[PDB]
Structures are given as C-alpha cells and as structure tokens.
Design a binder for these strands. Structure first.
Length: 1036
RNA sequence: GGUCACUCUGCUAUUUAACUUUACGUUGUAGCUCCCUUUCUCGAAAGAGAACCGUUGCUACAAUAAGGCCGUCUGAAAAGAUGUGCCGCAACGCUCUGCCCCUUAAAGCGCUUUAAGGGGCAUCGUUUAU
DNA sequence: AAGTTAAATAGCAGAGTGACC
DNA sequence: ATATGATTTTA
DNA sequence: TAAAATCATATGTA
C-alpha cells in the first residue's frame, strides 16, 4: 500500500507521531501524516494520583482497626464483668465514662478505681498506644508515663497531648506496656475485683498487636522471574548458589593488565582463590595480590586506582555464609575455627526462607522439618535477608557447575539454554499487543505506553504495517574517553564521600549523614538565626530541622540544593516562604544581611548559593518515567510487532541529544510556549533520524570533540557548527515541516494559521514554490487529540471539615489559628461583635506587625478581664466562611467543599441550554441530580428539570465541544463548569498561549447559544464527528 | 575496525508500587473553664445570682472520604454474640454488560430495519483481598 | 514521622554475541 | 490543577 | 437586568 517510517516522541503527557514515505533504498522521500496525542491530567499540588489513593486506603485501615480494637475492648470490659449492660447506651458507648483518664492513670497507682474509672484508663491506654519499634533489635523518680506526663508537662506547658505548635510528649508502646502491667498489679493489691486474669491478657494483646508488614505471598507477589526459566522465581542474593554464581562471574571475568598486555587468571590461580572468601570474612584485592604473588607491574583491570589505597576495597565478600556462620558461633553451636557444617541446598533453603518471609511464624513454617530447632532459633534470633539475583536457583544449579569447570558465563548459558540472552516471547503481530501490565507496577508509565500503542495501532489500521518504527529514548550519544572517565572520577568520589561522612557520623553515637555533612558546609551556624548550634542533640526531632528553603510547596524541589539546616526557633515563624520573603524582602535587616553573609561564606555548592537566594512553574520533573516508557516500548515493539523493513532489526531507538543535534543542523532550533504541536515536529525529525546518523554523530562527539548539545567543535582555529556533514532529508525541510506542524510558514509566528484543508494546501503550494510532493491526499491540518477522562470515581469532598450549624444562612465556620489569621479573616471572626475587646486587640496586634500573623502572634495572646487582669490564652478563633453548597460528612456532623465534578448533563428548552452538575459523592450515594445552574442564586432556587426539558448529552472532562455565539464560534476540549456562573471553560487543542488565558477560554456562556454540540475524535486527531445520546445515563 | 541492542555482575544518580503503625489536624458531643450579646431575679444603689445562645483553654469520647459488605457461634424465627474482619480518590483490558462512532451487504423511502464486522469510552471486567 | 519490601532507568566499569555502517 | 465566590462588562 | 467574561482565592501534616 505505502512504505513509511513511523517516528514517535513520547513524553509523560503526550506522544507526537510522524509518518515519512521512503523509496526502496529506504531513503525518506516525503512527509505523509503527523499528529500529537495528549493524555496529561495528574499531580496533586505534588506527587502521584495512585499515591493519593494509596495513602487514603492506608489511613482507612488505621481508622477501621483502631475503632475495631476499641469496640472489642468495650465487649471485653462487659464479658469480664467490669461493666453490666446498664452502663452501655443504644449505640454501644459507655455511659458517664470519666473524661479524666490521665489523672486516674496516675491516681490508680495509689488507690482502687471505680469500674468506670478503671474502664476509662484501659480504653485510654488502648486508644493511644504509642509507636512500637519495627526494625531488628537483636526514667528515674517518675514510675509511669501518665505521672511524667501530668507532673512535668501540665506544670510547664499547660497541656499533655501534642499540638503542631508545641510538640512535647511521644511515648513508646513498650513504655505504655510497663504502665499497663504496673496498674494491673497496683490495682490487684488495692482490692480491685477486675484484675480478672483473662482481661489482663486480653487488654494486653489488643494493646500490643499489629498485623505484620509482610506475611504469606506478600514478597513472592512483587518478586520478578528468571531470565532463563521464566516459570520459576528469581534466586535470593543471600543464597549459597547465588553468592557462589557472583563470586565465579567476578573470578572468571577478572583480568590482570601487566607492563604491556592483559591476561585471564590461570586454572591454578582460580583454584588458589576459589575457597578464600569462604575461609575469611572477605577477600580484598590486596589479599588476592599476595596469594597469587603477581609482581608490581601487574594491576587489576577496571579497579579505581587514584591517590588512595584502592586495593583495600573488598574483591568478594560471602555475606550470607558468614552471616549464618557468625549467628551459630554467637549462640555457641559452631566453632569460630571450623567451617559451616550445612549443605548447599540447606544454605539455599534458609537464605530464600528469610528473603521471602519475615514473621517467625512464616519462616519456621518453611524451615521446621528441614532444619534442627536449636540452630533454627539461633538464626531466627540474628538473620535478616533481602534482595534477589536475576536468575532462578534452578538455572543457577545448572550454570554454576559449568563455571567451576572453567566456562565463561555466556558459554555456560549457551550450553544449557542456547544463548545468554534470556527466554523472550518473540511473536510478531500486525497490531502491537496489549502491554502485559503484570510486568509494569507504575501506572503513569503504563498509561503512557498504553496510549503510545493506541497511536501505533491507529496508524496501522489507517495505513497498514510500517517499514520501521523510530522511537526517541533518553540515552546520551556515546561520550569521548576524557568525558566518561571524568564522569567515572565524580561517580567514584560520590561513593568515597558517602563513606567519609558515614564514618565521622558513626564516630559520635540516610537523613542522618545529610544532617552532619550539612553542619560542616554552613560553618555550623544555623543559616537564619546565627547561633553556632550545640553540636549534640541530632536526635531531638524538632531541635535542628532539615528545612526546605525554597518551599516544596511552591518549587517542587527535594534535590540536594534546597535544604538549609537551622534550629526550631526560626523554622516556626516562616511558614510557606522563600529565604528572601522570610528575611524581610525589599529593605535590608539583621537576619537578611547575616543570611547574605552565611551564604557568600558557605561551602554549599556554587549552583545552590545562587538557588537559595533568588527573589513559578516546576521546571525539571520525572524524566525517569520517560526513560522507562521509551526503553520498554523499543524492547516490546522489536519483540512482538510485524514490520515491512529491510533488515532483522527494524526498530531504531534514537535519543533526545540526537534529534536536538539534527534539528540544530536542519534549522529548527526554537522555544515551545507556542503550542503542544512541537511534539509532532520532533516525531518527524525522529522518523528521519537513522542508524547511520547515530554512528556518524557518535564518532564525531566521541573521537572528534564535537559538542553533543550544540554540535560545534573548537578548531585552536575558531569554533564551527558541523552542520554541512549532516544534510536534511529533502531541500525544503524547515519550510515543509513547520507549515504542516504549525499551519504557518517558518519565518514568523504572527500570520493567521491555515486552519483548514484548502488554506493549508494553498499555503504549501505557494511557499514551497518548487516541491510538488509536499502537497498530496493525506494533508489535513494538525488538530491535537486529547484523550477523554470518563471515570465516575474521584475524591468525594475536600479534607477540611467545617461546622454546618449555620449552613441555614449560607455560612460554615472553622478555627483559623491566630498564626494564620490575617485582617480579612478577622473581619469574619464570629464573636467579632460578641467580644469587641477581643476584635480590637487582635486588629491592634495585626496592624502593629504589618498584617503578618506569623510574627504578629509569635508572643502568646490573652483575653483580658475588664478589671485589666490577664485570663485565658487564645490559640485559634472561629471564623465565618461563605458556603453556598457542600458535602455532608463525619456522620452528618460537618460539611466540606466538593472535590471532583464527575460530569455535566446538558439540556435544551426553548432554544436555551441548562447545565446540571454531578459530583463524585452524588454518584456514590446514587443521587441522580435534579437542578440546573442559574447564575446568581443558591441551588435551593435553581432550575428544576422535568419531562418539559430536552436532554442533549453528558460532558466529561476533556470531551470535545462546539459552541456558536452570534458573537463568535468556539471549538475545544471541555475543561470546567462554574456553579456560581453556569459557564464552561474550553481548552483549545494546541493550548496556544496567545488565545484565552494560556489556551483556556475562560467563561464561555452557553444559555443563549445558537448551538452547543458535543463531538468525538480519535487518537490521531482525524475522525472528528458529532455524537448525539438518546437516554440520559444513570450514575450507576 | 567502529556503533548499537540485549544477557550477567559491580557501582553512581534517580524513580515507582505494595504493606504495617504512630503522633497530630478537622468537625461533632460532653465536662471543667476564658470572655461576653440579650433576657430574667435580689439589691435603695456600687453590685451579686441565674438562663438560652455565642465562644476561649484543657481533657475525653465519636466520626475521619461521600459510601458498600463479610466471616464465625447461638438461634424455628426475630434477633443476639463475635472478629490481628474487608472494600471505596489508580490504571489497564474488551470474555460478559452498557453507551457512542465507523464500515460492508441486503431490503425498503440524507433515514430505518436486518445481518455481519470493526473501533472508542465506560457506571462492565481485571489487578483486588470474602 | 517510624518501619518491612519489591520494581524500573540514565550513567561508569567488567565479561560476552550479533545486527548494522 | 479544579472549584467556585465576587465583580465587571456586554446585549 | 440576565447573560456573559473576568478577577480572585482556597485547597490535610510529621
């Protein structure tokens, strides 16, 4: 039918695609089609959406399980006769339960307690049980946490429980255990009847029990599969077999490079070393150097060799053998002199058992019978294993033998399986199959691939199977020798710096080495304050804080460039502010000039020095997801897609640097606010990028000192752009491609866009004077496809619950803390008039600190008693909020704003349009809404919709719509619908920033509109065609 | 010779998914408590006392998506007892269900019916736990 | 905040085979 | 980003 | 005035 290369530029958000027609020498002759497919949507303002779902489900479990254990505690209190049914209300709660639990917790140590008093203490210890340590483990004059809490905390601070403001007490669960049994004894000897034996054990286990983090197939479910025998799981790294396989790949692959040449190790040397890491803790390179004698002109190939004792670094360490050994030796079931008396298959079985299970229950469960209980408990007392190799225990059982008998890794694998490449599914299909999805546990990457494949099979259905697919990956053009050995130098010292700082950390006692290694950069003095921090107390959580100077709240940076250290005093009164906004802005100030000082004077990198002191949009984020998408797609297309191409390999994996360089050479270097359509342009440059060009460029930058970023070589002689050496696919590439990808000629963006078929053909005809092959059948103008989003799922409501007692008159109220209370908020404080002295005092303090409550309320604020005496402190005050709508929450005791408008149902009556919003929560409770928007009015008085009204369609986010005003005509992707306004927002396809507010038309009215119809479009941006629904769909 | 892809290993820099807990925060309700509008009561008046409502501080208890379920024991039933009790903000997918959109053939006069095929998106099916 | 896990890729290095220029 | 209150301009 | 545009503000944390 037609011979085309299909180019792809795939990003986190988009896939641009191009088709270039080729002769039978496969040279590219002409540009056919191009397009851009966007599927953007995400980023809670700042991580993932799947992550948000995760943390929801996490808390739902914590929530449920605490409620549940407290329920079972009430039940237990009844069954052991502490309570007698006349103390329980209808709902199951205890009647007249004392609100005194801290004071009775203390007092119980000295008196017998009322059944209700005792009940209250127990429920209190169960509800707040403190944190239990969950990593491997193998005060004085106060008696119990309650007493310490009450006596010290209530006297000094005026509160027991913590607050974000003053965080005092956190208690260990082991501490509260101590307390529990202490009260059980003290209470028995003071004649408490309910020291009821079963209740002691019951209460204690509800306190102490939490589910295990990893139990059953938890680990097997996440664990990958063997390169070679793909039915069997990967082998644990702490296996006899696997540790041995590593030691042999190291040993065989080892070379010594002497005065002149390079040589393998002789069978004799392989026998000399084979048993040496089993005989010691570890075999360093120095020890190898002596045992083989070598010389001193002989060196080891590929080992560092700097200005350090580089051969001190361990050549091989059998971690698991020595771990199991040391375990037995430490419990006196093995001689430190004698070797470990357990068979390979048993070291394997135990290594895996620990690596795939963590509960003592599970791992005995698998070891009981195969190993003797004495040593089982020994190991269980001391062993923790993680990490897996890439090959099964099985395939290794077969390989490691052949590698002992001299063979190289590839020779062993080739003998057993045919090749060392691993078992692949190569089943070429016409249409790219589904991505496995079992095999990618990362939903952003999965969606990007899945869209990429919908584009691919789109162009296969429209134009048949391509010759070749060209994909842009994230790798860098081959580097020069000097380049990559300096890359290696700096990688090496990254390692070497982490041990240096780690060592001096160990000296005194991930997060941790950063704290210490940042003390030194700042010459120790807290950046903001300038008091040279008490060297100690790197453990009092809140003293010295690893602060984000440029907020992660505004910047989206968690890199090693934006965390200044300081002590708790000055991280409080900054909130969400940059070091410049925090330290007094327009005019100088003590802390601002002390900050300018500290900054100039800090061994915090040259880059960062600029990055801490600046004065919007998060530039730089997840290229990791781009890498993965593209790498996997190249693998997947190469393995399982039919193509027409000349060779056996008809997928080319180009890269960014390549297309950047070629666009350099072909006169297309330019900036991107103009459109999302640049994604198509890069695609065609990708479709024209070739293997030849990859190699010519690679040899140019690697061997002839060409810059891999701008494509220029110094000479001393000048500096020249190696542009001539890489010609364009045809004579007028810049002109043709810019016109087809933008609708305008390359020279100036000012011109109207040839936004129609015949407009474009006339412009191409006119501007490419001499190129008749540019204009053909398949020359539509570029209309960007935006994937639709038709989930009825979503966040029910916002997480901030507000008082609904006055929802009556259109208001909620919430406690604004004083340190967040600005003048505008104070004007709606509820007791503004009920306590007018309060109002005037707050307004006074605010006006006095130039309306900055962070500083206005730093010193405590108090109510005064009219005789002039000081009374109660104020921390937060209740403030009225406008609330025309909302979601009833928390057992119908609160209201919260809506979160997600799932769809908008559109109706017609008398050539007028009416919109009914449907939110996620109505969906969840089956409510099919009733009332269309009416601009300046509560929903109570909105337009009710009966059989009188003609239903036209539903709108989901990113559905395509056309509106005709007598004023103008609009066509774009539905964005939002205003409750207060009854308008819609439209996203124009290419988000051309010059029209609307950055490509969104804000505030399109549709009530009077001559027409308002919903269209449908495909993945390439072609079959743009109106669609009319018959029935108004349910919500379930 | 070179370049690239892929396998294995060591490393440097990053990313993602799943899990178990904690301490807070929010709203509701109580008690004690700060202020304090209005209204009563006793004062000859300074004052004292009460009530609803607001609301400061501490402590407790409940709820912590909107919403849907499940085991096990008693029981004819009604219903009781009981649980390290479980789902719900993501993405994919087309075997079933539903909606939109093509295309072909037949038969009627741009539309419908039949038949078949194809595609998209889901409130359908999976990951996903009963 | 604490904590147990598995998965992926860009780069550097070491051992290999095989397509493509 | 979305949801939507508050304000201005057009018809 | 009704409808259409515009401006403006807020979002759970360790």
């Amino acid at each position: 039918s037609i011979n085309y290369i299909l180019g792809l530029d795939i990003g986190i958000a988009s896939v641009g695609w191009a088709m270039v027609e080729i002769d039978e020498e496969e040279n590219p002759i002409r540009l056919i089609d191009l397009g851009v497919r966007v599927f953007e949507r995400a980023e809670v303002p700042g991580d993932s959406l799947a992550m948000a779902r995760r943390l929801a489900r996490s808390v739902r479990r914590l929530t449920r399980r605490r409620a549940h254990r407290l329920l079972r505690t009430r039940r237990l209190l009844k069954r052991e006769g502490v309570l007698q049914a006349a103390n329980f209300d209808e709902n199951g709660l205890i009647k007249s339960l004392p609100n005194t639990p801290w004071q009775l917790r203390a007092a119980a140590l000295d008196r017998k307690l009322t059944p209700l008093e005792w009940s209250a203490v127990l429920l209190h210890l169960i509800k707040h049980r403190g944190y239990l340590s969950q990593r491997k483990n193998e005060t004085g004059d106060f008696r119990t946490p309650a007493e310490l809490a009450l006596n010290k905390f209530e006297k000094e601070s005026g509160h027991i429980r913590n607050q974000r403001s003053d965080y005092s007490h956190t208690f260990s669960r082991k501490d509260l255990q101590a307390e529990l049994i202490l009260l059980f004894e003290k209470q028995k000897e003071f004649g408490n009847p309910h020291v009821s034996g079963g209740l002691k054990e019951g209460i204690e286990t509800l306190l102490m029990t939490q589910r295990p983090a990893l139990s059953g197939d938890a680990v097997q479910k996440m664990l990958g599969h063997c390169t070679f025998e793909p039915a069997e799981p990967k082998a644990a790294k702490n296996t006899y077999t696997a540790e041995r396989f590593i030691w042999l790949t190291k040993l065989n692959n080892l070379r010594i490079l002497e005065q002149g040449s390079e040589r393998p190790l002789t069978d004799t040397e392989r026998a000399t070393l084979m048993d040496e890491p089993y005989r010691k803790s570890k075999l360093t390179y120095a020890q190898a150097r002596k045992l083989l004698g070598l010389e001193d002109t002989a060196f080891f190939k590929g080992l560092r060799y700097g200005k350090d004792n580089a051969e001190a670094s361990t050549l091989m360490e059998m971690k698991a053998y020595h771990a199991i050994s040391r375990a037995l030796e430490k419990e006196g079931l093995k001689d430190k002199k004698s070797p470990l008396n357990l068979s390979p298959e048993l070291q394997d079985e135990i290594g895996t058992a620990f690596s795939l299970f963590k509960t003592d229950e599970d791992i005995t469960g698998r070891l009981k019978d195969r190993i003797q209980p004495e040593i089982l408990e020994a190991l269980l007392k001391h062993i923790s294993f993680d990490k897996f190799v890439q090959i099964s225990l099985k395939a290794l059982r077969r390989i490691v033998p052949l590698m002992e008998q001299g063979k190289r890794y590839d020779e062993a694998c080739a003998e057993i399986y045919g090749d060392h490449y691993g078992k692949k599914n190569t089943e070429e299909k016409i249409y790219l199959p589904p991505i496995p999805a079992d095999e990618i546990r990362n939903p952003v990457v999965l969606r990007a691939l899945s869209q990429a494949r919908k584009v691919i099979n789109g162009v296969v259905r429209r134009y048949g199977s391509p010759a070749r697919i060209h994909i842009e990956t994230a790798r860098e053009v081959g580097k020069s020798f000097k380049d990559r050995k300096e890359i290696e130098k700096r990688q090496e010292e990254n390692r070497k710096d982490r041990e240096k700082a780690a060592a001096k950390f160990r000296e005194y006692f991930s997060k941790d080495i950063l704290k210490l290694r940042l003390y030194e950069q700042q010459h120790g003095k807290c950046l903001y304050s300038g008091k040279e921090i008490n060297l100690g107390r790197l453990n009092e959580k809140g003293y010295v804080e690893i602060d984000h100077a440029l907020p992660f709240s505004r910047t989206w940076d968690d890199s090693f460039n934006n965390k200044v250290l300081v002590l708790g005093s000055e991280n409080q009164n900054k909130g969400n502010q940059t070091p410049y906004e925090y330290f007094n802005g327009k005019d100088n100030s003590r802390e601002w000039q002390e900050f300018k000082a500290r900054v100039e004077t800090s061994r915090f990198p040259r880059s960062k020095k600029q990055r801490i002191l600046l004065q919007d949009g998060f530039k730089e984020r997840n290229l990791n997801d781009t890498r993965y998408v593209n790498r996997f797609l190249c693998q997947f297309v190469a393995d399982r897609m039919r193509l027409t191409g000349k060779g056996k390999k008809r997928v080319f994996a180009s890269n960014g640097q390549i297309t950047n360089l070629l666009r350099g050479f072909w006169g297309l270097r330019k900036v991107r606010a103009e459109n999302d359509r640049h994604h198509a342009l890069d695609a065609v440059v990708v479709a024209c990028s070739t293997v030849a060009m990859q190699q010519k460029i690679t040899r140019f930058v690697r061997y002839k000192e060409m810059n891999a970023f701008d494509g220029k070589t110094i000479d001393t002689g000048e500096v020249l752009h190696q542009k001539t050496h890489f010609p364009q696919p045809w004579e007028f590439f810049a002109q043709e491609v810019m016109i087809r990808v933008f609708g305008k000629p390359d020279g100036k963006p000012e011109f109207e866009e040839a936004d129609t078929l015949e407009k474009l053909r006339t412009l191409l005809a006119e501007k490419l004077s001499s190129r008749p092959e540019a204009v053909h059948e398949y020359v539509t103008p570029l209309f960007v496809s935006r994937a639709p989003n038709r989930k009825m799922s979503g966040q029910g409501h916002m997480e901030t619950v507000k008082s609904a007692k006055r929802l009556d008159e259109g208001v909620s109220v919430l406690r604004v803390p004083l340190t967040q209370l600005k003048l505008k908020d104070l004007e709606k404080m509820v007791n503004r008039e009920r306590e007018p002295k309060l109002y005037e005092a707050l307004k006074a303090r605010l006006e006095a600190h130039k309306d900055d409550p962070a500083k206005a309320f730093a010193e405590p604020f108090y109510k005064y008693d009219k005789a002039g005496n000081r009374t109660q402190q104020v921390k937060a005050v209740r403030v009225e909020q406008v609330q025309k709508t909302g979601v009833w929450v928390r057992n119908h005791n609160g209201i919260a704003d809506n979160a997600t408008m799932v769809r908008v149902d559109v109706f017609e009556k008398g050539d007028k349009y009416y919109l009914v919003p449907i939110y996620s929560w109505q969906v969840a409770k089956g409510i099919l809404p009733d009332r269309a928007v009416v601009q300046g009015k509560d929903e109570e008085d909105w337009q009710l919709i009966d059989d009188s009204f003609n239903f036209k369609f539903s709108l989901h986010p990113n559905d395509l719509v056309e509106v005709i005003t007598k004023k103008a005509r609009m066509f774009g992707y539905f964005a939002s619908c205003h409750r207060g306004t009854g308008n819609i927002n439209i996203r124009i396809h290419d988000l051309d920033h010059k029209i609307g507010k950055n490509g969104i038309l804000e505030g399109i009215g549709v009530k009077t509109a001559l027409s308002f119809q919903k269209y449908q479009i495909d993945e390439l941006g072609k079959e743009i065609r109106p669609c009319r629904l018959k029935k108004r769909p349910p919500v379930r």
